[PDB]
Each structure stands twice: as structure tokens, then as C-alpha cells.
Symmetry: D2
């Protein structure tokens, strides 16, 4: 009751030690250079932790939603950019799971579950970032095939994901929400290009790239879901990926709190370990307490996500909004807690603050989460 | 997972229905003339919700600790004062459960479980509230009986509860925290008097009285647990009722967010429903998100209060501190959202605000909670 | 420079003694029985702080807006209900000052300034509370007079004020906000009655009653500036009384923190940090109110913004501080035996009346995106 | 017409002055300053050309002698566009305060003209590895070698170091402490490796290491053994400059935020027609302006050196810094994905803001000073 199965905890100790071993040192370096955490990718893949959400049918680990966030958490605790790997894979493969045809699922999800390829997910566009219902990217038919044209931006793991679940308008004059569909674009696919990797505040490692569609023709079997169903797919994909982002935020903050506690037990200003100043003790109390509320809520919403509960819209958004807020609130405090040392790149709290910010921004800025929560409350 | 069981959800639905009609309408009156929730206690007892935690063995409903919290929540949601009936009942009976001898337990718990008698719990002392190992209340052993002297303060439901698990030193030189034992005082015991009931900011209904012991002869069977081990028992009980006060805070806040939501959809300023202004929407979003986190952590800590988990103290402190703090923010916003109306007692939210304040204060002020947490963090 | 003139501080020691000595002990009762701060009113009157804003021209104290705010603060420091007397007097006289012809100013301001009469201000309406530009209290001209029919609500200090600058729409047609004018209704004036005093969370002392107008025959000399300007005048006065509500909040917070600090001396670093946050927020709120108050007196361009900005922040701060004040005093802080309970309840309203901090944030936003 | 609670008209002329100096000369370089972690040299050149390298220096010594509001306003209006660039007047006042507050007319004369002219920059060595905040327990020793002194030890966290010219470092004489202008060229005086910082990446934060640095006896600043009464004063007076730094960073962030939200449209309406973004900008502007005004009250209070200058100083830095963080965070939030990228400054202003909360007495230390000034 109100706890992960102890199974989840064995899973956690696993992914935790994978994170402590193969991710952490590489996290500091990943961030500095803003290059992909490849070591993280081969270590997650080597431990079959790269995309544990995939079903058993395709060779996945079959992770529970709570189990899936646990992985994303335990990674973000040490490296936010790497933490995106199973998180972006769940995000980009979710339209393919929740609505994909059996043939398309069997095509694509086994290569992920195996580790051949990572997914990215192209929904946002620069002239309609949060207003995903009124996008510009275009899927016109051409024979059996599909021509995509247009813009996707803020696409995570771009350049590295092989597969890109794009959402493009199929019938530009139908009832909003029924004119958009999802198509798995490959890196192969001619005319599909990437934009410059963005110069990011945090997640500097995991590339956030614009991806351009210049008459990208693609077979008909890469339609995922039916036609027009792309927004009804994207909504349930948000519904489920919000909680992954919540867990990522919880994780970023957890790593920050861990360095905070360690540093306060080691260092001694005014003769004593700063850990024992009641001020700092209050600060750690708020950090730990907020973090634990955010954790429990992302976990509740994950329970809401595998059980596919009714109010998953609300709690998912809320868990994402709060966890991210908490992450900022905590990681900033963590930086504050290490004083001068904290704003040094030698210690991870700096990176962790820079990293936590996107949890408040990307996958729908928490203002959108508040819009969603409000619309859900007025029912 | 992260589900109150269908058992609990039905239980929730039950106690909610009892709160709505049988308790809520009286809530304004209970608070106003600062009177005990007689209607509420009556209705809870007739419905087995007055102290549902009590063991089956002694005729209680055998309520899960989570379920107990759920009841205190749903009661508090409409009337905070009334929720102390099950809350202070769990508080006062818990030392009698956690350490009580089979006999004394079977003496008192039936009286409670049926609804004949109420419990209060005397541990804190006017002088050194948080340094409980240094309490002045002594019980001197005299024959089989004891003679009590001392000063419990801040003791909720006094004057109205009949049996009082008071904690007294039984060694002015015995060892710290092992020099104290627990005694069930009756409302009948000579020399046992109450102070004038405190004039409280909120929870005005439930009486907060001083406890005076003037050479109170109490029989020898009133000892619960060993002599000396009462402190360990008291600290464990603290760990467990922390979470029920947390649930109460969540409840007070839930009432605020409910009445606010209602008032917001219907009432109109500038001619569209004020819930159309995205600002009020953000505010309501934050209220709901904070509140839901506070709720989920109250529930997690309730689970840990059943399993007697290690970090039960930490998670309970966190649940109380967060639920209460969050409640304060929310009920304050609740007053805000109803504007001029919310400032009047015609609407309850103002009362709910006064009530959230005490949850930040009694049952271990959130500062003390933050200390407890910071202490578990610095293991 | 960036400090009260030494005579503002001379004014502070004066009203501080008046508040600590004459207002403070009764404040607890003022709140307890939810009755008017009579002791406070007669003592503020005895000390010329019941309405020090009035020009000396009418026998007032001639206080600059900064001074008015400081008075309101030193009163709110001990009694918010009491702190509203000078505050609601400046509020109710402000339309009467800012635009009234010297006729009505000379008829009203001396009787206020001296302390015969208190003012309240009828702008807020239940139906169109936040949208004051679309209010529904009607006043049609009957010969030289006007007739009033309508319903002002949440009129603070309403039960006891004599003179009431109530603002009514005179011409429904035309641009709402340019069709509103203000007229001072008397307590004895025929047909004008009050509702039942609101049972309030805090400031219970200062009575807020509805104002109902049942065909009140008001003379034509009750005109407060040219017909139709009333909304121009009303947002003009809000511009100034925002800053006084800020000052009130600063005071309420101050009192909360004062009992907090005192209590902390009486009975570790965590509580120190909490007190530091309290005091620091408080002082930012105080300086923000004073910057704005000086900004009002010189009738600066951005008084719209700063009055809002100070009104919101001070009030917000008051709320956390008074809340935190209650927190520091622990169980004792949750009792009416100590005033911090009353002070928290008092501070809440500062976020609400005279434009909810939602409206304050909107007007602020508005000036930001001009 | 009464100028109470408002910065004087001359301060305001100075403001559009320094604002134009920043917009027109500093602003374009801020992005590069942060990206490369290099000293804002162009900014220093235009500040020196415009009497802003340390305008606080007296007119007796050739500065403009600007009052604490004036110097603060410069630090703000500069930080408004580049935090690192704002450290120029800020770190110069920081390093010059011991030399002013207790320095002998000879020692004032040896150095303050080189600053006021714009030749040399000053930095200030008080904090250390072991006892930064506990100034009573440091371990950098000044031994009286003849009339002269031998210095050994390590100051840490020293802004503009390696690049600044004169270093008023403070050492214990008898284990208590005195202040000494160590020169860059002085024998054996070296710097540690510069920190790779979260923000203020332009302004170098370096260790100060001494292996038997001999410095003449006239390098003494103030009283021998009694620099400590000078050190708490330098704090008292310089918090407000770090605060104004915070206000400036914060104001800049709010400026880019407003610009973006008016320029950008979303869901078909401008993103600032959404009341959520509106309240958000309102909270930002009011916190911001409150922190600004308290910075100004504390600056005036550092001018006439009031009794409570400690509290009002600490609070203004602690609040302005905290508010700056709070604002820049929302600023990054407001520009969405665009705000997350370094192509827009809101991100840099956030990192710049995270330090105003930390250095030169972390707001936790600021709160301690406030709590002690409260129980007076």
C-alpha cells in the first residue's frame, strides 16, 4: 500500500548502481562538453535500462510506469541528460504504443527494446509550441506514401535518435484534433535534417535540435495510429510523459539534495559543520520534504499512467509541474547550500540547477500544466 | 499502487457523505461559539467513524492507519474541530495500543470503540514542550497506585475526553527518556483538574485545555507498558499521529479548494466567470497541486505508520509539515479567491484558514517537524 | 535622502506613543467584541492622527502622504481596526479632496479634520465589485438635487462614519468610466441605511456594513467634482489609498514581528533565519510603501503601478509575516491571549480590499505592457 | 514638490548615462563575456572612459565621489546588461573600502588615484578555505619583519583576481588582524586556478596564495591588529553594491522577459494577454522594484553610515539577490524553450543571479547578520 513493490527497489538499486558507476563521472563531462552521454547509453543498454517501458512482446523489460519513472529518476539523480534516454524513448514510442498499428509496433518497438535505436518525438513547432493543435508540418499523401514538410523544434535526442515519431497535419480542414497524424520518420529518410544543437542552460548533453522536413517521403506503413488520430495520440502521450518528466525533476533534485547533505556533513564554517546550523537544517528539511512530496506525486501519477486512470491529465500535469518546481526550488537551494563551492562546475549542484530548469520548461512549460490543471478542476 | 484500496475508497465515500450533511452544516456553529462538535461526534459514533482506528479485538472497526487518515481528512474537510474526534482519539489511545497491557487495553479501547468514552493524550508540558525527556510531571509510586503531580498543557479534547494517556517521570534520577511511563487518567480522578479552555484562533470547537494533577491517586493498572518505557512509547505514538494531523491539514485545505472551486466557477466579475481569468486558473492549479501532493504524502506516511517503517518519523514529520504548510497557503488563497465574501464567516474558507494555522502549530510546530526531518537526514 | 524627514520620524514617535499607550491595550478587546475602536478613535482624535492628511486649510494636520502612511502604520502596528480610522478617512475624503470644488471641501474637510465626522467611501458594489467601471448604483438628477437608488457593499468603517463619498452612475449611456460621479451622503440623510456589519475574519472592530440607498434625496451641493468624472476620480483616489493599505500592512506585519522578536528573547539559528526573512520582507514592504507614498504626494506618473506594487507586496508580506509570527509563538501564537492571532487575521484583508492583489497584479501587468 | 523617498534628479541623469553606457557599449559583449568566461575588457574600457570604473572614489583623489545610491545605480544599470561587467565598480568599491574606511591619507594617496583614474582595479581578500565567514578564525598570517611584513596563507573566492591590480588582503598580526595592499607584482604572490563558475563567468574568481610575500610597512591599511573593525564596516557598506548588482541582473531579466512576452504570440493571442503570464510579470516587477528600493534605502544608509546599516545592508543584498534569482528563474521560464537557450540572455541572467545570492556573504550569512542586528 502506497509503496513501490520491493521489486521496484531491487530495480532501483540496479539502476542506481548503474548510475553511480557508469553515468556520474560521465555526467560532469557530458555537461561540460554538451556532448551526448554515450557511456550512459551503452550502460543503460547493457543493463537493459535504456527503455524499460517497452512491452515484453518486443523484447522489452515490461516496466511498470512507477518502475519506468524510478529509472528516469535514478538517472537524473546523477545525470539529467542521460536520464532523458529512457524518458525520451518512452515519449517518442508512446504514440507508437498507445495507438500504433500492430504491424508498426512489431516493426519499431523491438529495435528500441533491444537498444538498436532511440526514439525522438516531434510535436512542437516554433509558431505553435504549446498550441500543438494548430501546427504547420504537413503530411500529404503521395501514392501509398506520405510527404512530410515542416518544422519540429525542441526535439530531444535529435541527431542520435534513429526514429522520430512526427505529428504532421493530414487533413488541414477537419475538426481540430482530427487532422493530425503520427509518422515514424527515420534518420535515413531523405529531406529530414536536424538543426544546430541548441546551446542549452542544462541538459547540455542530450541534444535539443530543431528537425526540418524538406519533402520527406515515407512509406504508408509508417503511419502510426490512424489518420487524424495524431492529437488524440499526442494527448495521451503527454498524459503519460508528464509523469516521466516529474520523475526526472524529482531525480535532479534528489542528486542535488544528496550533494547537499554530503557537503554539509563534511565542511565546517564557524568551527562547525554547517550541517548542524538550525538554519541549514531547516533548508534541508524543506528540500527533503518538498522532494518527497513531488516524488510521491509523480509516483502516484505513474500509478495513474499504467492503470490509465481518469484524472491522469490532472495529476500527471500536477506531478510534472510540482516536481519541476521542486527541482528548481531544491537545486537552487542545493547550490546555495554549498555556498561558493556550489556555483562551481566542480560540484554537480551547479549543473543540477541548470538541468532542473527545463523540467519546468520542456514538454510543456508548467504554465501549460497549470492551464491543464485548471481545465480539469472546472469539471 | 498509490491507490487507497477500493475498500478505502468506499470508506472515503462513506465518511465524506457523513461529513457533508451530518457534520458540515454545523461546522460554522462549532467554530463560532467554540463548542464541541456534538452533532459530529454523534454522527461519527452512529457510523463507526469517531475513532475508527481501534482494534477489532476490542470491538473497533480495525481501520487501517491510512483509512484513519482518510476519515480525519474527510471530516476536517468540512469541520476541522470535528476531525479531532478520531484524531485525538487515535492520539490518546495509541500509547494504550502500542504498549498497553492486554487488560488495560481491553478496559479502555471498548469504551472508545463503541463511542462511550473519548481519549486525550497528555505528553507536552508548558515549560519545555519539545524537550519531553525533561518533563516535570512526576508519578510517585505509592502502594499499588501512583500519585500524579504535574502540568500537561496544550492538550486537545480535554474536558471532553474521559481517559487521558498522560506521560510522567517515574525517576527524578533514572535515565533520560527511560525514566517516564504512561498512565490512563480518568475524568473522575481526584486532584485532576483542567485549566480554562484556551481561546484558540481556529479549531475553536475542540477544547484545548491545560491538565492539572494535584496529588491525583491513579490505580496501578493505569500503567501502560513498562515503567520507564513510556517515552519510547510516546515518541512512537508521535511518529504515528503526526500523519493523522497531516491528513487533517490536507482535509482543511481540501475543503478550502472545494468551496473555492465552487465559488469560482459560478461567481462573476467583469461579466465572465472569474475561473476564465487564467490568473485565477493558475492560483487554483497551484492550490490543487500543492494540496494533492500534501495528500499523497499524508497517505504514504499513513502506510508507513501501519508497517512501523524506519523513516516513519521522518515521513510523518514531512507529511505533517507539508500538509499543514500547504494547507496554510491554500486556505489563504481560498480567502483570497472569495474576495470580500471570503473575509466573512458567512463563508467557511476563512475559518478553514484559521484552522490550517493550528496545523502549522499544534502537534509539533512545523519548525520542530523540520528539525525532526533534518535530523533523520543527517543520520 | 531615501529616508523620512526627521519630522516624519518625529511624527512616528508621536503616533507610536499614541498607539502603544492609548490604542494597544484596547486593540485586543476592539477585536474580541468585534466593536469599533472607540478608545482608539477618541485617542487618535486627541492626538490629531484620526485623519492627519487633511490640508491645514480646513484645520487638518496637513500631513504629507508619507506621514499619513506612517500614522496608519504605527496604528496598524497595534490595531488594524484602529489603523483604518485615519486610513478610511483619507480614503473617503480623497475624492472629496482631489476633485471637489472648494464649496464641498470647506463643507466637509474641517468637520473631518477636527474629528466631528468620519468618512467612508462607496465605490465597491456586490454585483460589480471588481468592475467598478460598470457599477449599478444609480443617481438621476431631480431638479437641482440628485436621487440615489443602489447598493454599495463592503464599505469599511461604514457603521460609524457620518459622511460618505458614494459614487453612482449618472448617465448609463456613454463610456462607462466617464459616466460616474461622486456625492457625499450623510448618516442622517433620508432613506440611506446600512446593512448588518459583516462578521469578518479580522479587523472585526472597524465595521464593514452594506450601504443601501432607498431613494435618498441628496442636494445638488453634495456634488464632488464635475458630473461624470467620478471614475477618473475613483481610480485617482485608489492610486493614493493603495499606498495607505500598503502602509497598514507594513504596520500589521511590524506588530507581528515585534511580538515575535520579543517572544524570541523571552523564551537556535532556524528561528533566527525565519525572523530575518520576516524582518527583511517587512522592510522591503515598508520602503516600497514609502517610495510609493512619496510617489503619491508628488503625484508621480506611475503612482498607478507603485501604489499597486506596494499594496500587493506589503499585504503579501504581512500575510506571510503575521503567519510566521503566529508560528514563532507556537501554541501561544494560536491563542487570542497573544495578539499575533488577531494580527494574522487582520493582515489577510490587506490582500483583499481596495483591489484584491489579483487586481493589483493586473493593473501592474497593464502598466508593464503599455 | 518634495524629493523624499526617490533617487535625486542627478542620480537619474547618472542613470540614463550608465544605462546608455551599458546598452550602447556593454550589452553586446555580455553574451560573449559569459560564454567565454573572460574579463569584460570592452566594458572596462567604456566604464573607464565614462568615470564608472569605481565612481565612488572621492573627488579629492580624482573620482566622481558618487554617493552610495549613485555608485549602486551604476552597478545595477551595468548588471542590467552584464553582471560580470557590473563587478568592475562593485569589486573596486569592495577592494577600496578598507583603504577608505581606515586607510591613512598616505595609503589612500598611494592607490586611490590609480583606481579613480582607471589604471588599476581592486579586489578584496577576506574569506578563506577554512574560515571565510568566521573572520575571527582565519590562518593567513602577517608577521612584522622589521617595519615590513611577511605574508603567508591563502585567500579564496576573490573576484576580479588575476586581473585586478591591487589586492587589499587582510591578515592576522597576533593570533588580531590588519589590512594590506598586496600588489600583483609582489614577490611570491601568486593566484590559484580560476574557478569555472555557474555565473559571473566573465569576472574571474581565483584563489590568492602567498609564499612569504614581503610587503612594506606602508602597505598597512588602518590600525595594526584592528583591521577587523574595518572589515565589518567594508561588509556593512558593500553588501548594497552586491544587492544593486542583483537588482540590475534582475531588472535586465525582467526587461528581456517583457520584451519576449509582448513580441511573442501564442495560442493566437500575445503570450502576455494570458493572465498567468501577466501575474507572473507583476510578481516579478514588484519583488524586483521592492528589492531595488531597499537597495537604495541601504545605499543611502551606507552613505551616512547609519546604525542599522548592517541590517538594511544585509537585507538589501539578501533580498535583491533572492528576488533576482526568483525573477531570472521566471525570466528563463517566460521565454520557454527560447529562454532555455543561451541565444537569449535570460538564461545567463539566471546563472548570474544565482551568485548574487552567494558571494560576499551567502544570504544565509546575510540572514545571520540581520538576525543579530534585530536582537539589538
Amino acid at each position: 500500500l502506497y509503496r513501490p513493490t520491493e521489486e521496484h527497489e531491487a530495480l532501483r538499486e540496479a539502476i542506481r548502481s548503474v548510475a553511480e558507476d557508469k553515468i556520474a563521472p560521465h555526467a560532469a563531462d557530458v555537461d561540460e562538453q554538451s556532448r551526448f552521454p554515450q557511456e550512459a547509453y551503452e550502460a543503460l543498454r547493457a543493463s537493459d535500462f535504456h527503455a524499460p517501458h517497452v512491452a515484453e512482446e518486443y523484447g522489452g523489460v515490461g516496466a511498470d510506469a512507477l518502475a519506468t519513472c524510478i529509472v528516469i529518476e535514478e538517472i537524473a539523480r546523477v545525470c539529467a541528460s542521460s536520464s532523458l534516454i529512457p524518458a525520451v524513448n518512452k515519449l517518442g514510442s508512446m504514440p507508437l504504443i498507445l495507438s500504433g498499428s500492430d504491424e508498426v509496433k512489431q516493426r519499431y518497438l523491438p529495435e528500441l527494446a533491444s537498444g538498436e535505436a532511440m526514439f525522438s518525438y516531434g510535436l512542437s513547432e516554433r509558431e505553435a509550441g504549446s498550441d500543438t493543435a494548430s501546427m504547420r508540418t504537413r503530411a500529404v499523401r503521395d501514392g501509398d506514401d506520405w510527404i512530410l514538410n515542416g518544422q519540429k523544434s525542441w526535439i530531444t535526442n535529435a541527431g542520435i535518435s534513429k526514429y522520430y515519431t512526427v505529428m504532421a497535419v493530414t487533413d488541414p480542414d477537419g475538426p481540430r484534433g482530427r487532422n493530425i497524424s503520427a509518422f515514424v520518420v527515420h534518420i535515413d529518410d531523405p529531406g529530414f535534417s536536424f538543426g544546430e544543437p541548441e546551446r542549452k542552460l542544462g541538459i547540455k548533453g542530450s541534444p535539443t535540435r530543431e528537425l526540418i522536413f524538406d519533402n520527406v517521403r515515407i512509406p504508408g506503413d509508417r503511419l502510426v495510429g490512424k489518420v487524424g488520430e495524431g492529437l488524440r495520440t499526442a494527448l495521451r502521450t503527454l498524459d503519460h510523459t508528464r509523469v516521466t518528466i516529474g520523475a526526472q525533476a524529482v531525480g535532479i533534485a534528489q542528486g542535488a539534495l544528496d550533494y547537499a547533505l554530503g557537503y554539509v556533513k563534511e565542511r565546517k564554517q564557524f568551527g562547525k559543520a554547517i550541517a548542524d546550523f538550525q538554519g541549514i537544517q531547516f533548508m534541508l528539511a524543506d528540500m527533503a520534504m518538498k522532494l518527497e512530496a513531488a516524488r510521491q506525486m509523480v509516483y502516484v501519477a505513474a500509478a495513474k499512467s499504467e492503470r490509465d486512470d481518469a484524472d491522469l491529465s490532472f495529476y500527471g500535469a500536477a506531478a510534472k509541474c510540482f516536481a519541476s518546481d521542486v527541482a528548481m526550488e531544491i537545486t537552487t537551494d542545493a547550490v546555495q547550500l554549498l555556498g561558493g563551492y556550489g556555483y562551481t562546475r566542480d560540484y554537480p549542484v551547479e549543473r543540477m540547477m541548470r538541468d532542473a530548469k527545463i523540467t519546468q520548461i520542456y514538454e510543456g512549460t508548467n504554465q501549460i500544466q497549470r492551464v491543464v490543471m485548471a481545465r480539469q478542476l472546472l469539471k
